Amino acid sequence: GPVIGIDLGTTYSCVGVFKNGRVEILNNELGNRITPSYVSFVDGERKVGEAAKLEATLHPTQTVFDVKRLIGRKFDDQEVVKDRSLLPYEIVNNQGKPNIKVQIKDKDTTFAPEQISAMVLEKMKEIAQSFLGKPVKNAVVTVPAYFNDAQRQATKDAGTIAGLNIVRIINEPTAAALAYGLDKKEETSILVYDLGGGTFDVSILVIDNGVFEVYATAGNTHLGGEDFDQRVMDYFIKMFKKKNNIDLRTDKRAIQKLRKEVEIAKRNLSVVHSTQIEIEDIVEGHNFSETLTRAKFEELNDDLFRETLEPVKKVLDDAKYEKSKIDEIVLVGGSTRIPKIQQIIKEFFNGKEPNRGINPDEAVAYGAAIQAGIILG
């Protein structure tokens, strides 16, 4: 039967199939190749993906996301304590493990992380089933290289709930290396720099005659594109207050509209130097109309961009590597499209040019689908 490839990310998932010798990254029911990893429990309905994410503004306690931060961890882990103080939905201690508590028709309902991740996996399964016109029972699913056995098993258990046998767990750096087709012959050391919406991971991957080994990994669990958007949000909220005596934070719908336009503006500024951020009646009778330049975008985020080098230094130090010891730099995650990110990486490595894909958001799912193809022969 078919084996599909799923990137189960922190902020999103992505599903690919291997069919007639080509990988096809599949569109969800809204036409998007990336699906936000959100699940909403509002008014007796359960939504998964973009429709769930839209519930977060008005139903923040009922809109579950970032469950990958909890999966296979313990409630008292330092990282989980920090995530409970950041996340707006209730997290409870179930026999030492974090569980998610929501209401369904007013009833308290408690889910293991893998039950929420299963709902994401079921949606990816259904996309694949509709496209292949046949049932899917098997998948390759990606994990972070730093995932321990409990985190990998909880991910497999998410698959089993979704009716997917996870025939192989591959780490995200290996998935990237397969996607970019890095030559498997002889020995190659690769720096995989993965800057997503919520998280930053960097790994040293060694490929030795077809055998992939991650020699070192480091990152920042709370550094991604969402943080760069928030820096912009913060600035324009201060400016709108200075000019108009309106604090946009007092209206959650206004903040939601601004965040959508700021995200688009950031993406524009990876290509152009100046963009307009425009919302008619951001509150009643008050338009939002601003210009953001690439220079000001960079100025607002310079410290966060340069923070990404701290984990790069750590993996080189952990592996006892010279910068020169790295043979190729590979970028994954949509945030690696920011020109300043590529410049800083290039300059840290004493001029060396990074390799970057053209669809860096899909590279991991693409490699998972390649691994599916490899397993079927």
Ligand SMILES: N#Cc1ccc(COC[C@H]2O[C@@H](n3c(NCc4ccc(Cl)c(Cl)c4)nc4c(N)ncnc43)[C@H](O)[C@@H]2O)cc1
């Ligand atoms: N929840 C959720 C969710 C929604 C979209 C994405 C994809 O992006 C991961 C990160 O990558 C960032 N990013 C992206 N990602 C591309 C992208 C954005 C939205 C969708 Cl639906 C898809 Cl097909 C792809 N492009 C960027 C660009 N041109 N310049 C700077 N940052 C860019 C994006 O802003 C985000 O922070 C990830 C998760």
